Structure formats: structure tokens, C-alpha cells
Amino acid sequence: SQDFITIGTGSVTGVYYPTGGAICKLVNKDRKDHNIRCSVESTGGSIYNVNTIRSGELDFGIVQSDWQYHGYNGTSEFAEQGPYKKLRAVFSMHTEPFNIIARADSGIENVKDLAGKRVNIGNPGSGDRATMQVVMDAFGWNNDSFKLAAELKGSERSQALCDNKIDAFIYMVGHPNGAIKEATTSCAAKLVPATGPEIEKIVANNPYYAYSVVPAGMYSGTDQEVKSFGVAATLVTTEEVSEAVVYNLTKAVFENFDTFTRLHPAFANLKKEDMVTAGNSIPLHPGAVKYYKEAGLIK
Numbered sequence: 001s002q003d004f005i006t007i008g009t010g011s012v013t014g015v016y017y018p019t020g021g022a023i024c025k026l027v028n029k030d031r032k033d034h035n036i037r038c039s040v041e042s043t044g045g046s047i048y049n050v051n052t053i054r055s056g057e058l059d060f061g062i063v064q065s066d067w068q069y070h071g072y073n074g075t076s077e078f079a080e081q082g083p084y085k086k087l088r089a090v091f092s093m094h095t096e097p098f099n100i101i102a103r104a105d106s107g108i109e110n111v112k113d114l115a116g117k118r119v120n121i122g123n124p125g126s127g128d129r130a131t132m133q134v135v136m137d138a139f140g141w142n143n144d145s146f147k148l149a150a151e152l153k154g155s156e157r158s159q160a161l162c163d164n165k166i167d168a169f170i171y172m173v174g175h176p177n178g179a180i181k182e183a184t185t186s187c188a189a190k191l192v193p194a195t196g197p198e199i200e201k202i203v204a205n206n207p208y209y210a211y212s213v214v215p216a217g218m219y220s221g222t223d224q225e226v227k228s229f230g231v232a233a234t235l236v237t238t239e240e241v242s243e244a245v246v247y248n249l250t251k252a253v254f255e256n257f258d259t260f261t262r263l264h265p266a267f268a269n270l271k272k273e274d275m276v277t278a279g280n281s282i283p284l285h286p287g288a289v290k291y292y293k294e295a296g297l298i299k
């Protein structure tokens, strides 16, 4: 029996990393019963997580809902990898807006203003960069459309923005998170909206992109709500992982749901029924289905 699982997440100042930590705590507290030990890995993000589940070095991964769909189908960012039809959904979680964090004197007031600036578009292997490519397609942009197209991982973007190495960085991430808190607090960075006909087309044409709002007061300096588009964070796995393992992880979260929603402020408004279906477009792992049917959440 498999007795040790690893969850791939993201940069340590994001939301994926403490999300993994919360899931592993709920799994580990009953390790004397199901003999499952859970550990968390900081990684490059959604794209690395899918590819590393597939290569066998991760058992679970947290993945944006758009790259759950495209990783399973082998399309868009995953086109050269081919389909991965063993990928399975477990549950979805918080919303992740497409955030733009800019210097106060950058002149960047909307997403269209990113062209011709020094923009961190994201590290290879992050959902940040893969979804930024969707934005670039809607605008007809490539890397040369920016003065500089930097590829820093999440934990390094705020320090680069404060050092005046970039004018802005993007981040597909839930709220609040430590990366954006640092930039807005310590460097007077501003959260910039992404609206206009290009964003409207992105939302209208895809079921996994929906309008998003970050409320005023989430960060110091951003005194009005910030509109954009967002995806859902989802936990995925492979059908190679045993039904018993996925069943016990799913049960650990859903049977301790009131505890889970107290472990990070991004989980405060999660709803069990939505976690089964929302943002999940590929088959659910049989172990998760088994729990959901016991709990009355399915059929």
C-alpha cells in the first residue's frame, strides 16, 4: 500500500503552498489510522505540477482550472506533451484572478498598458505564464511586444518590482497572498485592472474564465475594487494513485471542512457542493467519487 504522498504547489509566498500544507495537516492527523503521510513541495506552478504528476514524482498537484482542462486534453500549453488522459480531478477551491501589480509611477492603468513596458510574464512551468500567453494572444502580443519579458518565479517578483528592475508583474493567484502584500505595502505598488474588449472576449469564449473582483481594502493603496478575469484552483491527481489514497485525502478535507475553511483566508467562502463541480472539467478520481457518494454530494 502507498503510504507517502507529495502535493506539488507553487512559490512559497503564494496561496497554493499553504493550501498544500493545510491538506497535508488534515491527512497527517489521522496517519495512525490510514497510515498515509503527506508532504508539500514548492514548485514552479500549474504546468510543472501536471507534467510532474505525469512523470511520477508528484502524486497530487494544485492546478488552475484552465490547465486542468488543457493538461488532460494535451492542448494549448501542453500541445507538445500530448494528451494525459490519466489526469483526474479531486476537488476545486478558491478563485484566482489575473492580477497585475505595477509600480506607482509606471503609467500602467489597465492590461493594455503592459505593452512596451518591462513586464514579468512568469516562469516557464507556472500557470501565470501559460495564462499570460492567452492574454497575449487576445492582444496580438509576443515577447517582443514588451521592452523586457522577465520570467521570475513568484517568490522573486516583488523584490524585482521594488528594485526597479520591472515595471509590473502578473500573478494568477488568490487573495490575500504574501507576494502582493509585500509589493503594495513596502513599495507603493498598485493592483491594476484588466478590462476591455480583449478581456471580455477571453471571458465570453471560455467556460473556465469568469469575471473577477478584488475588493477595496484587500491591500493598502488599492482603495477601489479591481476587476479582471479569474480561474479556479483545483487539486488533481492521476488514476494511477490508488482509490484508497484519494478517498482518504478527500475525506480528510471534507469531513474536517469547518477546520479547512479556517486555515487560510482564501478558503473562507468555499462551499462543498461547488468544490465537487465548479472548475472541474475532467473526470473525478474514483476515490473522490467514492467519498462524494457516501456524503450525498454526488447522486
Ligand SMILES: N[C@@H](CCC(=O)O)C(=O)O
Binding pocket: 009, 010, 011, 014, 015, 016, 017, 044, 045, 046, 047, 063, 064, 096, 125, 126, 127, 128, 129, 154, 172, 173, 174
Ligand atoms: N496559479 C499559479 C500559482 C498561484 C499560487 O501559488 O497560489 C500557477 O499555477 O502558477
Ligand code: NA
Binding pocket: 202, 203, 204, 205, 206, 207, 208, 209, 210
Ligand atoms: Na467564461
Ligand code: NA
Binding pocket: 277, 278, 279, 280, 281
Ligand atoms: Na464542472
